[PDB]
């Protein structure tokens, strides 16, 4: 079924903009949405088909107090995304309260693409945790979408902010988001501003313009995570059949990333799997262990080599699973697209469920616990206080995310057969 992407907030609109521009270049699409004259892919899911081959993606752009979205509009690609669905504070509560009044018209914007498509399977959110306007509104929209579409599933391309810790209410905002996501998100893919920044300092000398260059690092992950859907294959030709292996239990739906050529500007499959399992290629910053690992490779890959590579990786033991289950490394293959550079002819990515991400959740929880004892930024603004007089949704969020931390470490324990 066709995927509708709900990019929201300034940062999320930036990454959705870059994601659709990269799919414009990767597919046979021009900046005006026209089919390219120079051009074998499954473009049905991600791009709506007009009769004059206007491949307009099913992007829903939400602007709240818009600045960046004006710059999005004065672009050469403004004709490419034309489904005409752009509708006009730094606190979570301000974003939530601003979303509540316009929920019906933005939901009618959801409804129109839902009717216009043949079918719809997932809502993929370019969400920003603690992103001022994006946070809060994304949590509220996340809460509305599962009620209105109970059979349907929601993915979150969460850019989890770690910038070495400006937003002084950032742990509070992030805390409330993670409660809303843990109960009301089917899947979450996590990304880290510090980890992408350390990889920026690794592969290049870029330090000060960190966000603009990390946009490309995020967009390569976001494209390679969907390439096996966007191009056909033997297996993983549906989002949901991909999703089920990555998420074994519903509470732990958070997925780490990695890329074998971080400098993607011949290599055998044994080499690229071994390089992927090393921590320098991972883009995420008591025993600890994976719950399940998957990998997808795109390029000039020899077919009988990959099973010998799986045996070889099994003997290398660069990462060991040891959960309660039979989870194994799962090899998958896709085709690199034409017309774009085939540099690093073999190139791959991994998605995995790892217990190390609980430490990162605990970090903003620790910052929140210290800030909550101090009460230095309760904000006391009349929006904040009139919205939450009790300030107990932060405590419900704390107990829910503490359940999540305990569930992660219980998944590390030998007995997750009992209740976690």
């Amino acid at each position: 079924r066709e995927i509708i992407t709900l990019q929201l907030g300034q940062c999320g609109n930036q990454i959705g903009f870059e994601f659709w521009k990269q799919l414009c270049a990767e597919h046979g699409i021009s900046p005006e949405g026209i089919v390219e004259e120079f051009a074998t892919d499954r473009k049905d899911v991600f791009f709506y088909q007009a009769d004059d081959e206007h491949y307009i993606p099913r992007a829903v752009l939400l602007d709240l107090e818009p600045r960046v979205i004006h710059s999005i509009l004065n672009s050469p690609y403004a004709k490419l995304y034309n489904p005409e669905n752009i509708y006009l504070g730094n606190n979570w509560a301000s974003g939530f309260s601003q979303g509540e009044k316009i929920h019906e018209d933005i939901f009618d914007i959801i409804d129109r693409e839902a009717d216009g498509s043949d079918s719809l399977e997932g809502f993929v959110l370019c969400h920003s945790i603690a992103g001022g306007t994006g946070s809060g509104l994304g949590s509220y929209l996340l809460e509305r979408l599962n009620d209105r579409y109970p059979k349907k599933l929601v993915q979150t391309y969460s850019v989890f902010p770690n910038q070495d810790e400006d937003v002084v209410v950032q742990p509070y905002n992030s805390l409330l988001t993670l409660k809303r996501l843990t109960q009301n998100a089917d899947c979450v893919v996590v990304l880290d501003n510090t980890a992408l920044n350390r990889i920026a300092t690794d592969r290049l000398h870029i330090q000060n313009p960190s966000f603009s260059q990390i946009n490309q690092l995020v967009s390569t992950i976001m494209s390679a995570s969907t390439t096996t859907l966007r191009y056909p294959g033997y297996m993983n030709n549906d989002l949901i059949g991909l999703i089920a292996s990555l998420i074994p239990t519903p509470r732990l739906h958070f997925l780490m990333t990695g890329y074998t050529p971080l400098t993607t500007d011949k290599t055998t499959v044994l080499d690229v799997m071994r390089r992927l399992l090393q921590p320098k290629n991972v883009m995420v910053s008591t025993n600890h262990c994976y719950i399940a690992i998957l990998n997808i490779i795109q390029g000039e890959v020899d077919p009988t080599q990959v099973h010998k590579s799986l045996q070889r990786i099994r003997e290398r033991k660069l990462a060991n699973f040891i959960p309660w289950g039979p989870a194994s490394i799962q090899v998958a293959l896709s085709r690199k697209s034409p017309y774009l550079p085939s540099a690093h002819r073999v190139s791959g990515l991994m998605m995995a469920n790892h217990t190390s991400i609980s430490s990162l959740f605990e970090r903003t929880c620790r910052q929140y616990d210290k800030l909550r004892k101090r009460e230095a930024f309760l904000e006391q603004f009349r929006k904040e206080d009139m919205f939450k007089d009790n300030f107990d949704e932060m405590d419900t969020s704390r107990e829910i995310v503490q359940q999540l931390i305990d569930e992660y470490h219980a998944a590390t324990r030998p007995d997750y057969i009992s209740w976690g």
């Binding site: 045996q311 099994r314 699973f321 040891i322 039979p326 989870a327 490394i329």
Partner: protein, 53 residues
């Protein structure tokens, strides 16, 4: 709630695991080829449950 369901769960889980043993063990007598056992039985999981004879 569980009297009708968990009764069907355990009898299916025991019947799944037994036929999962018999698939692995009858493929293990087949000495590429023996790797379908060691793929199914990855890093320590269900590679030693019941030794035949």
């Amino acid at each position: 709630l569980v009297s009708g369901f968990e009764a069907t769960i355990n009898k299916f889980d025991k019947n799944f695991s037994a036929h999962l043993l018999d698939l692995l063990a009858r493929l293990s007598i087949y000495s590429g080829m023996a790797s379908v056992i060691s793929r199914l039985d990855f890093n320590g999981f269900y590679t030693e449950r019941l030794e035949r004879l």
